[PDB]
Symmetry: D2
Subunit: 292 residues, 4 copies
C-alpha cells in the first residue's frame, strides 16, 4: 500500500490527447499481475501538469473502476494555492483512493512556514492519508527536513515522496519523525541507495515498463538483501537514466508504446514527440533491461 | 507602453483575500501621477499563482476600467498547458489590454522545442502583442537566447521579460533579434545594468512603492545618463534587495500598507504575513530610499 | 590500516607557526589509546596548503617517529603538477608510511584523461599504496567514477577518499572496481550514510576531538549495526557541522586547545583566529558530544 | 599599462616541456606590433600552476628582457600561503615589472577576513602595484565586492581581474572604490559587456591569437563605440568560447602553433595534448575569426 514498488502510472492518450481507457486497463492489469504495490494516478508522470481539474478527476475515477479493488490507488492532489488544494482534495474524499500525493507549491516559492501552514490546512480538511512531495527542480521550492518533522506530527500526514536525489535527506528526516512515517524515493536512479539508507519504497517511472523487476528489487531491499537487489538495479540503470533523456513522460510513453502496453505515445503540449535520437537511446535501455 | 518603468502591480486585497477596489484605484492613480509607463496586471507580483482564472480576469478588467485610458495595461496570461494558455489569452482578446506577459511553462520542464511550440501556438491564436517571460528559479525551465531568436520571428512576439539576473543574456538575445524586439528586466537589483547593456526597461517590484524614482531612473537610462541614474539606483538598492527578504509579494504588500497606498497587506496562502524581522528590514530600506 | 576511523590530524603549532612536537606527541598518544585506525599526516586538516615541501616532510617524519610503530601513518602527497607529485612521493618511499593520500590537481582543472595520466604516472614510480582524493569544492575538479574505475586497475591505487558528500558516488564507484578497493568518506556529516551504503571508513576531522566515539561508530557500521552507530553519530552531528563553521582547521584547532590536547590554536595565514561567535558555536557542539 | 587589451601570454615550450626562447620572442614581437597594452607573464594561461618558482621567475625575467621596454609586463605572483606570496613578490621587486597579478588563495578557502589579511600583508611588503585576481571556479574562494572595497584603501592595491563572468560585480565594486581603481575582465566571452558596464579592459586568452582585433575592440569600447566593438566581438565569439573547449591553455597553444606563432604546442601534465575533435573545433573558430 505505501511501501515497495509504487508506479507513477502514465495517463495513456489517443491521437487527440484524450484518455485511452483500453490502454489504461492493459496497464492496470499489468501492474496487478506483476506485483506493483500501488498506483499513483495523475502524478507528475501522469501529466498532472496538463490535465484540467475535471479530466484529472475522471482519470482517477477510471483508474479506481479498472483497478476494481485489486491494487490500491493514490491520487495526485497538489496545488500552489492552499484553497485550491483543499477544494480539490474534497472531490476525492470517499472516492476509494487510499491516499493523496500532494506536491509543495510550485512557482510561488513560499517560506518553510508557508509550507507548514499549507500542508497542515490540507490535512485538517480530509480524513485521507497525505504523502508530501518534494521535487525542487520542478517547483523552485525545497521542503526541508525540519519542516517535514513538524508536519509528521499531523495525524494524517503519513509520509514523503523525496525526489531531490540528495540521499542525505533520508536519515535527516528519519531522525525527526516516528518509525511509522514512510519515506519513498521519487528518483529512480538513486532509489535503491535511498532504500538501503532506510527508505521504504519508490514512486517510480521505471516501474511503468519493468514492473516485475522493480517489485522484486524493492522486496529484496526491504529484506536487507542489497547485493541481490543491486544486480537488478544495474540492469535497470540505463532506464533509470534514459527515461529522462527528454522530459518525462515523453520517453516512458514511447517505451510503453514500443512494448505494446498502450496504443499511442501521444502527450499534451508543451510536451513534444520523442526525437529519433531519443528513440534510439530508450530502445537500447529497454534491451539492456531485457524487455525487448 | 513597452519601455521605461513598468510596474508589476500588487493585487491589493481585503482581510478575506479578495480584491480591494478602492486600494487598486488608489494605486493606479498613483502610477498615473508618478510617470509609470505601463501596468502589468496579475503578473507574479500580482499573485497570478493564487487567483483562479475568473478572479484573474476580474482583476485585469477592473484594472483597465480604473486606468480609464490613462496608462496602458499588460495582462499576465501564462499557463503550463498550451491549450489552457490559448484559452486564457482568447479571453483577453478585445478586452483593451495592449499586450500579454506569458511565462514559460512551469513544473513540467519542456524541451526548447516544446517552448517554441507552446509560444508559437499561443501567438497564433491572438492579435495581441506577446512578451515572453523567463524566470527559471520559479519555473524550473530556462528559455535560452537561441529559442528567443526563433520565436522573435513570429509576428506578434515582440519582447521578453528576462528575470534570470544573468546580464550576459542582454546581448546574446539582441544579436539574434531585430532592433525593435523589446528587452525588459525582471530583476530589480540588476535592471539599471541591464538597461546600460542595451535593454529597454524593467518590469518592476520596486516601482510599486517608488514609482517616481523608478520612472526618473529609466528616463535617465534611456537618455544615456547612467551616472545620474546610478545615484537613484543606489538610493533604491536596499529596496531592490529587501523587497525579497521574504517571498514576493509579502514585503512589497507590507510596504504599500505602511505608505498608505493600500488598506491591508493581506495575501493568499501559502504566502504568509510578514515576520517582525521582515517589517524592520523593509522599514529601514523605505527610510533609505527617503520614502518614509 | 585503510578502513575504520582514520584521523586527518591537525598540525599543532606554537605562537610562531612552527610545528609543536610536544603537542603532536599528545595527539598521537591520544589516537593510539582511543582506537583510531590510522593517521593522515599533512592532509587538508593538517594545513598541507601552507607548509612548504620541507616542513611537510618534517611533520610526516616526526609523526612516524612519535608513532613508533603503534599506529599506521599515511602522508598527504598531492600536487597539481604531475612532475612535482612524482618528485615529492620519492621523498617518502621507505620513510615508514603505509600509503599516500594524493589529491586531484587543484586550480588547473584538468580533463578526466589528464587525471588518469596524472595518477597513473604517480603510481608507476612508487611501490606505496595510493589513495586518490576527490574534493571538488577545494580543487575545482571532480574525479568521476568512470575514471576511478580506470585507475583502480593500476596495482598500487588502492582506494579513494570521496569528499563530495554526494552519496550516489559510493555504489557508482563500487560497481566499477574490485571488492578489495577501499572507499573512504572525506565528509564527516555524511560519513555514516557513506558507510551504510558500502564504504569502508572515514578520513575524519571530528576524530581529532572524538576519537573513541568515531572509532566505535565505525566498528558498529562495519558490523552492520547501523541503528547503534547512528545514536553515536547523532551526538557527534553538531561537531560534524560546526567544525566547518569557519574554514577548517580553524574550529578543530580551537577545540583541541580547549580540551588541552594541544598548547596553542595558532594556524598559518591566510587562516585566521577563530571569531567569538565561532568559539561559542564550537563549544556548544563539544558539550553536545559530551566532551566538555 | 593597466587598461585596454592585456594578453595572458602562453609560456611556449619545447618538446621537453621547458620554455622556448625563440617562440617567446616571436610572441612578444607580435604583441608589440599588434597594439596589445601589456603582457601578463605566468598568469593562469602561462601555466603558473605547473612551473616551479625558479622556472616562473626565469620566464618573467626572459619576458622583460625580450620586451626590451617596448611593452609593460605584469607578473603572476599569487600563492595560497601568505608567507610564500610575500617571498614570491619580494623576488620581483626591482625586476622591471610594472605590477603583480595576485590570485586569491586556492584550495584552502579562507574567510573574507583571511583574504583581507593575505592581500594587505602582500601589499605591505612591496612597492609594486597589485591587481587582485578572483577566479572562484579554479580556487574555491570568491573575493566579494565588500572585501575588494576594503582592500582598495591600501595604497598599492590598484585593481582587480574579475573572472567570475558575473557582470553585476562591475558596478558593485565600482560603487565601493575610487575612480582610479582599475576593473579588468578575466572572462573573454563577457569582456566587452564588462567594459560597457564601466570596466577598463580585459586580461585575455583570445588576445594570444587575435591581438590586433582585441586591441581595436578595446580601443572602440574605451571610446564609447560599442556597436563597432560588438561587430569585432561577434567575429571573435567562437574563439572566446572554443579556446575553452578543453582546459586552458590546451586550445590556445594549439592555435598558436597552427598560426606559426610558436614552434610546439607542448604543455606540462596534467594538461594533455589537444584531442582531434578539439583541433577541429578550434580550427573552425580561427576560420570564423578570419585568422586562417
Ligand atoms: N499556478 C496555477 C497552477 C496551474 C495548473 C496546472 N496546469 C494555479 O494556481 O492553479
Ligand atoms: N599551484 C602550486 C601549488 C602551491 C603549493 C601550496 N602552498 C604548484 O604548482 O606547486
Ligand atoms: K503523522
Ligand atoms: K516579432
Ligand atoms: K588497484
Ligand atoms: K589603492
Amino acid at each position: 500500500m505505501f511501501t515497495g514498488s509504487i508506479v507513477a502510472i502514465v495517463t495513456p492518450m489517443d491521437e487527440k490527447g484524450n484518455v485511452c481507457r483500453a490502454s489504461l486497463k492493459k496497464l492496470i492489469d499489468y501492474h496487478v499481475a506483476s506485483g506493483t504495490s500501488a498506483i499513483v494516478s495523475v502524478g507528475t508522470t501522469g501529466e498532472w501538469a496538463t490535465l484540467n481539474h475535471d479530466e484529472h478527476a475522471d482519470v482517477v475515477m477510471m483508474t479506481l473502476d479498472l483497478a476494481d479493488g485489486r491494487i490500491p490507488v493514490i491520487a495526485g492532489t497538489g496545488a500552489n494555492a492552499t484553497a485550491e488544494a483543499i477544494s480539490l482534495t474534497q472531490r476525492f474524499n470517499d472516492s476509494g483512493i487510499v491516499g493523496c500525493l500532494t506536491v509543495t507549491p510550485y512557482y510561488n516559492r513560499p517560506s518553510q512556514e508557508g509550507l507548514y501552514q499549507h500542508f497542515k490546512a490540507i490535512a485538517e480538511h480530509t480524513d485521507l492519508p497525505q504523502i508530501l512531495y518534494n521535487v525542487p527542480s520542478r517547483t523552485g521550492c525545497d521542503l526541508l527536513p525540519e519542516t517535514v518533522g513538524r508536519l509528521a506530527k499531523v495525524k494524517n500526514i503519513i509520509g514523503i515522496k523525496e525526489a531531490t536525489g540528495n540521499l542525505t535527506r533520508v536519515n535527516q528526516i528519519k531522525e525527526l519523525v516516528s518509525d511509522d512515517f514512510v519515506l519513498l524515493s521519487g528518483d529512480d536512479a538513486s532509489a535503491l541507495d535511498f532504500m538501503q539508507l532506510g527508505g521504504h519504497g519508490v514512486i517510480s517511472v521505471t516501474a511503468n515498463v519493468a514492473a516485475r523487476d522493480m517489485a522484486q528489487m524493492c522486496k529484496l531491499a526491504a529484506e536487507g538483501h542489497f547485493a541481490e537487489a543491486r544486480v537488478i538495479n544495474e540492469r535497470l540503470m540505463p532506464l533509470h537514466n534514459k527515461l529522462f533523456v527528454e522530459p518525462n513522460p515523453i520517453p516512458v510513453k514511447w517505451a510503453c508504446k514500443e512494448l505494446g502496453l498502450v496504443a499511442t505515445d501521444t502527450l499534451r503540449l508543451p510536451m513534444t514527440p520523442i526525437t529519433d535520437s531519443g528513440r534510439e537511446t530508450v530502445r537500447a535501455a529497454l534491451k539492456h533491461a531485457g524487455l525487448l
